[PDB]
Write a protein that binds this ligand. Structure first.
Ligand SMILES: CN1CN([C@@H]2O[C@H](COP(=O)(O)OP(=O)(O)OP(=O)(O)O)[C@@H](O)[C@H]2O)c2nc(N)[nH]c(=O)c21
Lengths: 327, 327
């Protein structure tokens, strides 16, 4: 288990400890994680490798830091002439009907990027462009720079040349001001702010995957329906962050068997956060009246315009009748 | 208005003219497109615009290139220290349990990439890697570079570290020898290899999108079923390239209305090219016995293991009976 993999595993343990109760990101937290799960590589190795986020704060506590994590401490302008190029979908292979391209200033945190999403519509392509950036930046100059890079990157499509700065949805993130932060439900709550920063959940080995599913059910179990009706919107969004990540780890039969949807306190969470949950298999609706429902284009019922049927356990008599079609 | 929009439309004019009539890619072809889509900007601003493909060939002709396009002239190793990142799903958010990443050398043509597709299965992670590259490359050494970049990029390098070069499928494309090419159905036919080089289809504006769709239908309409059975494989694959792009532009209702699938000669295209077509909305199967079928996990038919049901147009009286559920 290298130094990175151990760093990954300690971050897993902090995320898992965030499920049952909020915890301030400070060295004691990392210390409790090291109990059942120590750091076995050398501290000298750790002084070499460079990581970011909470794994860097794990590294610094392993290297003796006694102060708590300070929101905004990672701030960085990035290199204005080094760009990162990433994309999902293409015009020839779009994904869920869309293709999206994001170009950003390398090593910028918060990340200063221009994302251009596109789809085929009647009359050609519609584009939706988002400039994710920081308060006070030269937005127009930034846009015009990242736009050029989009044009040069994708062989100058007409559709991108047509996007004006006035077409661009601008999102200004604030840098922290050094607020201490609380980790709860895989999300950071900076003290003094109302927003959260959702963190990557991790938990990709079998053991931590099974722990994550266990802890979430127990966490919800540890709330009364009144407890849920009292939570701030920010903790609810935090819980949403974890719930949706868990259900993407199940097929429909496992998800229903998991049983989190059957709990009273979770029904109160469904009223505040929504009933529609993607899974590994498709999408379920945990409805308070109809029961468990499953996405189904042949559905006689609709939930927020999603066609659904009653999810029932797949039994072999339905599949024996599946008509194999001539090629 | 502008030079980029003009270049695109000269490029669209070639792609569109190629649907019905094959033509050598040489400067006289761009001359005759300039009749319908002139170039009003100055050659001096033309010289800053960086393009590839036919867009760059047009630019070169406008700047006075009088030689014909030579297959393989765009071949470039790329920068082995600059990388592009394509992802389809995520370890945090997989798509139907899968996530795929492709990392490639920036500006490599043919593209040299390593594609790792990964799934969460019972217990661990199954990976499949493909190295798409060029005849003659240092395959192992390219794999090890691209695998490193995949380890640095991954939210889960543990599952990547175990993939060995013996586990990786290699596809090698060949570079051209300077052959002249014919453009037909948006594809280059080098004289006289047996393969084609599919070209990107632009047509991002109202005029060229609508005409792209009417020409493809006109092309098929003006072949009988006997004409289609006499098409070589390379011409079948070119038609396939225009058919599949066109159907990515419609939702399912629009794809069906377009009616290309009702032409008897298209039924012969279907037998020879496949029945499964991706649209903007779903996957459709143009079946010869059952009609238009739509991918449907809960369908009672299967086409080549694809679960499907009969596609059904929205009818207001039926939509009126859909039980709208309470939120
Ligand atoms: C680590 N895991 C595990 N997992 C899901 O959880 C299951 C893993 O297999 P498993 O349930 O542990 O096997 P097991 O219960 O012992 O036997 P069975 O075959 O009956 O399920 C799979 O259905 C897989 O989709 C995951 N799903 C997502 N989205 N991300 C993840 O990191 C993980």
């Amino acid at each position: 288990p290298t130094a990175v993999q151990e760093l990954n595993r300690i971050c897993d343990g902090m995320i898992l400890s965030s499920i049952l109760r909020p915890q301030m990101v400070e060295p004691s937290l990392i210390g409790d994680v090291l109990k059942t799960e120590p750091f076995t590589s050398s501290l000298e190795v750790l002084k070499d490798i460079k990581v970011s986020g909470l794994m860097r704060y794990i590294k610094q506590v392993l290297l003796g830091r006694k102060s708590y994590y300070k929101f905004g401490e990672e701030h960085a302008d990035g290199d204005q002439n080094l760009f990162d190029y990433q994309f999902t979908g293409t015009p020839e292979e779009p994904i869920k009907g869309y293709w999206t391209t994001t170009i950003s200033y390398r090593d910028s945190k918060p990340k200063i990027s221009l994302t251009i999403r596109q789809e085929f519509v009647e009359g050609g392509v519609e584009s939706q462009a988002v400039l994710a950036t920081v308060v006070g930046r030269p937005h127009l100059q930034d846009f015009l720079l990242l736009k050029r890079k989009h044009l040069e990157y994708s062989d100058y499509p007409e559709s991108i040349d047509l996007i004006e700065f006035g077409d661009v949805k601008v999102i200004e993130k604030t840098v922290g001001h050094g607020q201490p932060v609380v980790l709860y439900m895989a999300s950071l709550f900076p003290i003094g702010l109302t927003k959260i920063a959702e963190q990557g959940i991790g938990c990709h080995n079998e053991k931590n995957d099974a722990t994550l599913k266990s802890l979430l059910k127990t966490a919800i179990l540890n709330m009364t329906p009144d407890d849920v009706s009292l939570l701030p919107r920010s903790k609810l969004d935090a819980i949403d962050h974890v719930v949706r990540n868990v259900y993407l780890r199940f097929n429909n039969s496992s998800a229903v068997s998991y049983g989190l949807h059957k709990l009273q306190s979770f029904e109160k969470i469904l009223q505040l956060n929504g009933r529609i949950y993607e899974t590994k298999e498709s999408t379920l609706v945990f409805h308070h009246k109809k029961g468990v429902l499953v996405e189904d284009l042949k559905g006689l019922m609709s939930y927020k315009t999603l066609r659904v049927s009653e999810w029932r356990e797949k039994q072999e008599p339905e599949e024996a009748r599946v008509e194999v079609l001539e090629e």
